């Protein structure tokens, strides 16, 4: 259960898991996440910006 440095994961095929729903951004108590998104070249719903300010994050 230990909470440590953040990381963005992938599916076994190598595709990113994140779909830019922004639920993590809306729930972050410290407002440490900033997200921008758009349709990818294949039409997939993927982020273009995903920042986490680790000096704002409360882990």
């Amino acid at each position: 259960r230990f909470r440590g440095e953040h990381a963005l994961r992938r599916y076994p095929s190598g595709e990113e898991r994140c779909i830019a729903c922004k639920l993590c951004e809306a729930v972050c108590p410290a407002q440490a996440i900033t997200i921008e998104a758009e349709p990818r070249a294949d039409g997939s719903r993927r982020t273009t910006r995903y920042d986490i300010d680790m000096t704002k994050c409360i882990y």
């Binding site: 779909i19 922004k22 809306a26 998104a37 719903r45």
Partner: protein, 230 residues
């Protein structure tokens, strides 16, 4: 006067004849749940979310299409109305896709909000869901028909407000699909309003896709300058 007396939860209200149960209820600040009723569109009655209990009547009535009678006492929060709402939302969500994170209607969905306010919190649907192929109606509007709840608001808007009779339903029963039945562009100077009237993500804006969520946006009230209508 011509006004008649009706009671909403034991409270007297005076309304003009022909007024529906929904309007009589909203004259005291009570908003009946709805999916297919729009006040600028002709009444449909198909969704069945507006069913309320009239006192001393064994049957629940569609508040969006039933005019109030003299002396009726509406019961907007009785056990019968709540059970009707829960059943209707259960049926609505039975075949709905688990698309909320990838849906642009995420924080702006009447399905979501009315499920949180009037529906249940669990599911007892243990079957497979249905899937509907997408229909292309042009560049401006993105179509994801699986999400459609068959309210038919878009059809009424096209037929009446826009004067374009291109949208309809094909088939019947569970496999009933809203579309044009042919590859056709739904082109109109007012074609973008079917995005707003659609309560779900079945009709969404294509230029706006995936860029933002409703809770992030800051709302500024302004005036349009693209024509002289203002």
């Amino acid at each position: 006067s011509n006004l008649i007396e009706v009671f909403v939860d034991g409270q007297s209200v005076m309304v003009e004849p022909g007024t529906t149960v929904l309007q009589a209820c909203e004259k005291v600040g009570m908003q009946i749940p709805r999916f297919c009723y729009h006040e600028r569109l002709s009444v449909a009655g198909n969704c069945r979310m507006c069913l309320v209990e009239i006192e001393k009547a064994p049957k629940v009535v569609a508040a969006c299409a039933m005019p109030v009678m003299k002396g009726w006492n509406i019961l907007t929060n009785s056990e019968k109305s709540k059970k009707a709402r829960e059943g209707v939302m259960e049926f609505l969500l039975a075949n709905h896709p688990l698309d909320c994170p990838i849906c642009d209607q995420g924080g702006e969905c009447d399905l979501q909000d009315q499920s949180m306010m009037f529906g249940s919190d669990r599911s007892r649907f243990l079957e497979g869901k249905r899937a509907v192929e997408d229909k292309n109606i042009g560049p401006l509007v993105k179509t994801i028909m699986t999400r459609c709840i068959q309210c038919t608001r878009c059809i009424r808007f096209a037929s009446e407000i826009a004067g374009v009779d291109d949208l309809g339903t094909t088939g019947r029963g569970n496999d009933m699909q809203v579309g044009t039945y042919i590859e056709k562009m739904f082109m109109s100077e007012l074609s973008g309003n079917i995005i707003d009237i659609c309560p779900v993500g079945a009709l969404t804006s294509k230029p706006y896709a995936f860029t933002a969520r409703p809770w992030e946006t800051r709302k500024t009230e302004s005036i349009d300058v693209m024509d002289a209508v203002g």
